[PDB]
Amino acid sequence: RNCFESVAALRRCMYG
């Protein structure tokens, strides 16, 4: 949900 919480979350979110 909060994509910009970790590098992992950010990556998976921006990928899809």
Side-chain angles (χ1 to χ4, degrees):
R1 330 74 39 230
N2 304 102
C3 298
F4 301 97
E5 69 192 330
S6 64
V7 298
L10 195 173
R11 280 174 63 195
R12 300 311 308 178
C13 176
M14 77 181 189
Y15 303 159

PDB file of all heavy atoms in Angstrom:
ATOM      1  N   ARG A   1       0.844  -1.207   0.000  1.00  0.00           N
ATOM      2  CA  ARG A   1       0.000   0.000   0.000  1.00  0.00           C
ATOM      3  C   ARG A   1       0.875   1.252   0.000  1.00  0.00           C
ATOM      4  O   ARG A   1       0.889   2.011  -0.968  1.00  0.00           O
ATOM      5  CB  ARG A   1      -1.017   0.042   1.161  1.00  0.00           C
ATOM      6  CG  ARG A   1      -1.543  -1.308   1.685  1.00  0.00           C
ATOM      7  CD  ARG A   1      -0.552  -2.126   2.535  1.00  0.00           C
ATOM      8  NE  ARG A   1       0.242  -1.271   3.435  1.00  0.00           N
ATOM      9  CZ  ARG A   1       1.580  -1.279   3.588  1.00  0.00           C
ATOM     10  NH1 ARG A   1       2.355  -2.199   2.996  1.00  0.00           N
ATOM     11  NH2 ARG A   1       2.153  -0.333   4.341  1.00  0.00           N
ATOM     12  N   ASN A   2       1.628   1.440   1.091  1.00  0.00           N
ATOM     13  CA  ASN A   2       2.570   2.534   1.258  1.00  0.00           C
ATOM     14  C   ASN A   2       3.872   2.136   0.567  1.00  0.00           C
ATOM     15  O   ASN A   2       4.806   1.682   1.219  1.00  0.00           O
ATOM     16  CB  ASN A   2       2.779   2.811   2.754  1.00  0.00           C
ATOM     17  CG  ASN A   2       1.462   3.109   3.466  1.00  0.00           C
ATOM     18  OD1 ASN A   2       0.918   2.246   4.155  1.00  0.00           O
ATOM     19  ND2 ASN A   2       0.940   4.326   3.299  1.00  0.00           N
ATOM     20  N   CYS A   3       3.910   2.276  -0.763  1.00  0.00           N
ATOM     21  CA  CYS A   3       5.019   1.823  -1.596  1.00  0.00           C
ATOM     22  C   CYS A   3       6.364   2.375  -1.121  1.00  0.00           C
ATOM     23  O   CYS A   3       7.350   1.643  -1.074  1.00  0.00           O
ATOM     24  CB  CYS A   3       4.748   2.178  -3.062  1.00  0.00           C
ATOM     25  SG  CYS A   3       3.267   1.369  -3.729  1.00  0.00           S
ATOM     26  N   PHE A   4       6.396   3.652  -0.723  1.00  0.00           N
ATOM     27  CA  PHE A   4       7.605   4.321  -0.265  1.00  0.00           C
ATOM     28  C   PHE A   4       7.768   4.137   1.247  1.00  0.00           C
ATOM     29  O   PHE A   4       7.832   5.112   1.993  1.00  0.00           O
ATOM     30  CB  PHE A   4       7.542   5.796  -0.681  1.00  0.00           C
ATOM     31  CG  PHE A   4       7.413   5.973  -2.182  1.00  0.00           C
ATOM     32  CD1 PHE A   4       6.149   6.172  -2.771  1.00  0.00           C
ATOM     33  CD2 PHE A   4       8.558   5.891  -2.995  1.00  0.00           C
ATOM     34  CE1 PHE A   4       6.028   6.238  -4.171  1.00  0.00           C
ATOM     35  CE2 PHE A   4       8.434   5.946  -4.394  1.00  0.00           C
ATOM     36  CZ  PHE A   4       7.169   6.117  -4.982  1.00  0.00           C
ATOM     37  N   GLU A   5       7.855   2.870   1.677  1.00  0.00           N
ATOM     38  CA  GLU A   5       8.148   2.462   3.049  1.00  0.00           C
ATOM     39  C   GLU A   5       9.486   1.717   3.115  1.00  0.00           C
ATOM     40  O   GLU A   5      10.197   1.823   4.112  1.00  0.00           O
ATOM     41  CB  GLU A   5       6.994   1.623   3.620  1.00  0.00           C
ATOM     42  CG  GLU A   5       6.860   0.236   2.971  1.00  0.00           C
ATOM     43  CD  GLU A   5       5.552  -0.460   3.343  1.00  0.00           C
ATOM     44  OE1 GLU A   5       5.049  -0.198   4.458  1.00  0.00           O
ATOM     45  OE2 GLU A   5       5.067  -1.250   2.504  1.00  0.00           O
ATOM     46  N   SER A   6       9.828   0.971   2.056  1.00  0.00           N
ATOM     47  CA  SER A   6      11.085   0.250   1.925  1.00  0.00           C
ATOM     48  C   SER A   6      11.459   0.165   0.447  1.00  0.00           C
ATOM     49  O   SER A   6      10.602   0.326  -0.420  1.00  0.00           O
ATOM     50  CB  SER A   6      10.951  -1.153   2.531  1.00  0.00           C
ATOM     51  OG  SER A   6      10.004  -1.918   1.812  1.00  0.00           O
ATOM     52  N   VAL A   7      12.737  -0.112   0.167  1.00  0.00           N
ATOM     53  CA  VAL A   7      13.228  -0.315  -1.190  1.00  0.00           C
ATOM     54  C   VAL A   7      12.519  -1.501  -1.853  1.00  0.00           C
ATOM     55  O   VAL A   7      12.202  -1.439  -3.037  1.00  0.00           O
ATOM     56  CB  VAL A   7      14.762  -0.464  -1.211  1.00  0.00           C
ATOM     57  CG1 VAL A   7      15.432   0.812  -0.688  1.00  0.00           C
ATOM     58  CG2 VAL A   7      15.272  -1.675  -0.416  1.00  0.00           C
ATOM     59  N   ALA A   8      12.246  -2.566  -1.086  1.00  0.00           N
ATOM     60  CA  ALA A   8      11.529  -3.738  -1.563  1.00  0.00           C
ATOM     61  C   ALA A   8      10.115  -3.356  -2.006  1.00  0.00           C
ATOM     62  O   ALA A   8       9.727  -3.644  -3.138  1.00  0.00           O
ATOM     63  CB  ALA A   8      11.498  -4.802  -0.462  1.00  0.00           C
ATOM     64  N   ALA A   9       9.359  -2.695  -1.121  1.00  0.00           N
ATOM     65  CA  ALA A   9       8.003  -2.244  -1.408  1.00  0.00           C
ATOM     66  C   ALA A   9       7.975  -1.344  -2.644  1.00  0.00           C
ATOM     67  O   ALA A   9       7.156  -1.556  -3.534  1.00  0.00           O
ATOM     68  CB  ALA A   9       7.430  -1.525  -0.185  1.00  0.00           C
ATOM     69  N   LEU A  10       8.885  -0.363  -2.702  1.00  0.00           N
ATOM     70  CA  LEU A  10       9.029   0.570  -3.812  1.00  0.00           C
ATOM     71  C   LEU A  10       9.220  -0.202  -5.121  1.00  0.00           C
ATOM     72  O   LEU A  10       8.451  -0.009  -6.061  1.00  0.00           O
ATOM     73  CB  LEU A  10      10.192   1.527  -3.502  1.00  0.00           C
ATOM     74  CG  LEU A  10      10.283   2.790  -4.374  1.00  0.00           C
ATOM     75  CD1 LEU A  10      11.379   3.692  -3.791  1.00  0.00           C
ATOM     76  CD2 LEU A  10      10.616   2.511  -5.843  1.00  0.00           C
ATOM     77  N   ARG A  11      10.223  -1.089  -5.170  1.00  0.00           N
ATOM     78  CA  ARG A  11      10.538  -1.904  -6.335  1.00  0.00           C
ATOM     79  C   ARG A  11       9.316  -2.680  -6.826  1.00  0.00           C
ATOM     80  O   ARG A  11       8.889  -2.488  -7.962  1.00  0.00           O
ATOM     81  CB  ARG A  11      11.698  -2.856  -6.016  1.00  0.00           C
ATOM     82  CG  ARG A  11      13.048  -2.132  -6.095  1.00  0.00           C
ATOM     83  CD  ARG A  11      14.177  -3.055  -5.631  1.00  0.00           C
ATOM     84  NE  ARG A  11      14.303  -4.218  -6.518  1.00  0.00           N
ATOM     85  CZ  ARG A  11      14.988  -5.338  -6.242  1.00  0.00           C
ATOM     86  NH1 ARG A  11      15.650  -5.476  -5.084  1.00  0.00           N
ATOM     87  NH2 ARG A  11      15.010  -6.330  -7.142  1.00  0.00           N
ATOM     88  N   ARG A  12       8.751  -3.553  -5.985  1.00  0.00           N
ATOM     89  CA  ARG A  12       7.621  -4.389  -6.375  1.00  0.00           C
ATOM     90  C   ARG A  12       6.425  -3.548  -6.830  1.00  0.00           C
ATOM     91  O   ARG A  12       5.762  -3.904  -7.802  1.00  0.00           O
ATOM     92  CB  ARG A  12       7.229  -5.346  -5.243  1.00  0.00           C
ATOM     93  CG  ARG A  12       8.350  -6.309  -4.814  1.00  0.00           C
ATOM     94  CD  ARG A  12       9.046  -7.036  -5.972  1.00  0.00           C
ATOM     95  NE  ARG A  12       8.084  -7.692  -6.866  1.00  0.00           N
ATOM     96  CZ  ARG A  12       8.414  -8.367  -7.980  1.00  0.00           C
ATOM     97  NH1 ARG A  12       9.698  -8.519  -8.336  1.00  0.00           N
ATOM     98  NH2 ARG A  12       7.448  -8.891  -8.745  1.00  0.00           N
ATOM     99  N   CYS A  13       6.159  -2.431  -6.144  1.00  0.00           N
ATOM    100  CA  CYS A  13       5.077  -1.516  -6.480  1.00  0.00           C
ATOM    101  C   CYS A  13       5.267  -0.910  -7.874  1.00  0.00           C
ATOM    102  O   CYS A  13       4.350  -0.978  -8.690  1.00  0.00           O
ATOM    103  CB  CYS A  13       4.976  -0.448  -5.390  1.00  0.00           C
ATOM    104  SG  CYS A  13       3.764   0.874  -5.642  1.00  0.00           S
ATOM    105  N   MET A  14       6.438  -0.322  -8.155  1.00  0.00           N
ATOM    106  CA  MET A  14       6.681   0.337  -9.434  1.00  0.00           C
ATOM    107  C   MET A  14       6.753  -0.664 -10.592  1.00  0.00           C
ATOM    108  O   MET A  14       6.342  -0.332 -11.702  1.00  0.00           O
ATOM    109  CB  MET A  14       7.891   1.283  -9.368  1.00  0.00           C
ATOM    110  CG  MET A  14       9.255   0.591  -9.415  1.00  0.00           C
ATOM    111  SD  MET A  14      10.647   1.745  -9.297  1.00  0.00           S
ATOM    112  CE  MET A  14      12.019   0.621  -9.661  1.00  0.00           C
ATOM    113  N   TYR A  15       7.236  -1.889 -10.337  1.00  0.00           N
ATOM    114  CA  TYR A  15       7.173  -2.974 -11.311  1.00  0.00           C
ATOM    115  C   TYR A  15       5.708  -3.308 -11.610  1.00  0.00           C
ATOM    116  O   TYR A  15       5.307  -3.365 -12.770  1.00  0.00           O
ATOM    117  CB  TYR A  15       7.899  -4.226 -10.793  1.00  0.00           C
ATOM    118  CG  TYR A  15       9.364  -4.095 -10.404  1.00  0.00           C
ATOM    119  CD1 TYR A  15       9.915  -5.048  -9.527  1.00  0.00           C
ATOM    120  CD2 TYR A  15      10.178  -3.054 -10.895  1.00  0.00           C
ATOM    121  CE1 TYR A  15      11.257  -4.954  -9.124  1.00  0.00           C
ATOM    122  CE2 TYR A  15      11.521  -2.960 -10.490  1.00  0.00           C
ATOM    123  CZ  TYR A  15      12.062  -3.911  -9.607  1.00  0.00           C
ATOM    124  OH  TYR A  15      13.367  -3.824  -9.221  1.00  0.00           O
ATOM    125  N   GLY A  16       4.917  -3.528 -10.553  1.00  0.00           N
ATOM    126  CA  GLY A  16       3.504  -3.846 -10.644  1.00  0.00           C
ATOM    127  C   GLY A  16       2.993  -4.280  -9.273  1.00  0.00           C
ATOM    128  O   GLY A  16       2.465  -3.404  -8.554  1.00  0.00           O
TER     129      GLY A  16
END
